[PDB]
Design a protein around this ligand. Structure first.
Ligand SMILES: Nc1ncnc2c1ncn2[C@@H]1O[C@H](COP(=O)(O)OP(=O)(O)OC[C@H]2O[C@H](O)[C@H](O)[C@@H]2O)[C@@H](O)[C@H]1O
Ligand SMILES: Nc1ccc(S(=O)(=O)N2CCN(Cc3ccc(-c4ccccc4F)s3)CC2)cc1S(N)(=O)=O
Ligand SMILES: [Cl-]
Ligand SMILES: [Cl-]
Ligand SMILES: [Zn+2]
Length: 282
């Protein structure tokens, strides 16, 4: 916990030039069109444009620790708004173009964006979510649960139980939730397209799940400013700001990015909406 390996921190950013970027986002559009089963994998990089610093980027929580500096928040977790990328992923699921979303983010923002919980794996837990130790019932709070490390928050269960409520934030030693990880693994293995968004993929087993798509001929796309662990294994790497890549993709796919209504919780995916007809590819 003092000595916990924090991986490689503050590696240089790569920026694809605009023509190369435009050409790579079109090829990402082509792979989404061809894919039966698209799984998205998200890391702290999708929440940097909403004021929340990442871990290993130039101004990351671990990077600044290594240099004896403090990370800088431009928001509270509570006042944080989902990004363009968060709202793009909401819409891609609604029109049936995303099968499953796996996130390492504890920032609560996929849930607040209105993303269906039944298509989300929160591998490292959720700051707004507490769980009953007895009935395993989860509560999505409008404020951050004040503890970390699967501790007692001080509230009791209201299930028609008085079970002790605990946070969902894994400590370094704590293994991933069996339900979320099993569902993340399954969706990853069965995917023909895995797209990683603002993750450096350095955490096991979180960062290895996109590799499971590569078995039986699936395609891997990494979108990230820095190198990631699995750059070698990727069919397509896109070095740009994830908001720019996702707005450009959504425009190629015929899809508008929807308004955020403010914080809302959807437990179960609604029936799919109409989507644009597919272009002729080959
Ligand atoms: N706007 C942006 N657009 C694209 N990429 C970005 C952007 N901003 C940052 N990045 C990139 O996004 C990447 C973010 O990678 P990391 O910072 O390792 O976060 P994780 O989600 O992988 O951390 C996993 C766990 O490790 C921790 O201990 C916690 O337990 C976490 O849950 C960087 O390479 C940035 O270059
Ligand atoms: N970007 C960022 C920066 C800070 C926070 S946080 O202040 O809410 N807080 C959260 C817990 N960590 C400590 C950890 C303890 C155990 C860890 C761990 C669990 C499993 C597998 C590997 C692991 F390393 S990490 C400190 C920051 C949140 C984010 S966000 N947008 O949610 O990703
Ligand atoms: Cl904090
Ligand atoms: Cl819908
Ligand atoms: Zn209970």
């Amino acid at each position: 916990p003092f000595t916990a390996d924090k991986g490689k921190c503050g590696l240089p950013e790569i920026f694809d030039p605009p023509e190369e970027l435009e050409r790579k986002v079109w090829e990402l559009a082509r792979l989404v069109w061809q894919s039966s089963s698209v799984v998205f994998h998200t890391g702290a990089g999708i929440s940097t444009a909403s004021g929340i610093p990442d871990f290993r980027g130039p101004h990351g929580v671990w990077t600044m620790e290594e240099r004896g500096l403090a990370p800088k928040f431009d928001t509270t977790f509570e006042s944080a708004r989902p990004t363009q990328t968060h709202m793009a992923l909401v819409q891609l699921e609604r029109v049936g173009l995303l099968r499953f979303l796996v996130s390492q983010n504890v920032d609560g923002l996929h849930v607040r964006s209105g993303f269906p919980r039944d298509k989300l794996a929160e591998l490292h837990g959720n700051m707004f979510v507490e769980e009953c130790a007895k009935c395993k019932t989860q509560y999505v709070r409008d404020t951050v649960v004040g503890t970390m490390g699967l501790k007692a928050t001080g509230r009791l269960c209201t299930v028609a139980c008085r079970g002790e409520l605990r946070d969902t934030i894994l400590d370094w030693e704590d293994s991933l939730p069996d339900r979320d990880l099993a569902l993340a693994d399954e969706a990853s293995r069965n995917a023909d397209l895995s797209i990683t968004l603002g993750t450096s993929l350095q955490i096991r087993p979180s960062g290895n799940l996109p590799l499971a798509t590569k078995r039986r001929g699936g395609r891997l796309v990494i979108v990230n400013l820095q190198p990631t662990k699995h750059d070698r294994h990727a069919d397509l790497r896109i070095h740009g700001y994830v908001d720019e890549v996702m707005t450009r993709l959504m425009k190629h796919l015929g899809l508008e990015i929807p308004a955020w209504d403010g914080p809302r919780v959807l437990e179960r995916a609604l029936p799919p909406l109409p989507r644009p007809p597919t272009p002729k590819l080959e």
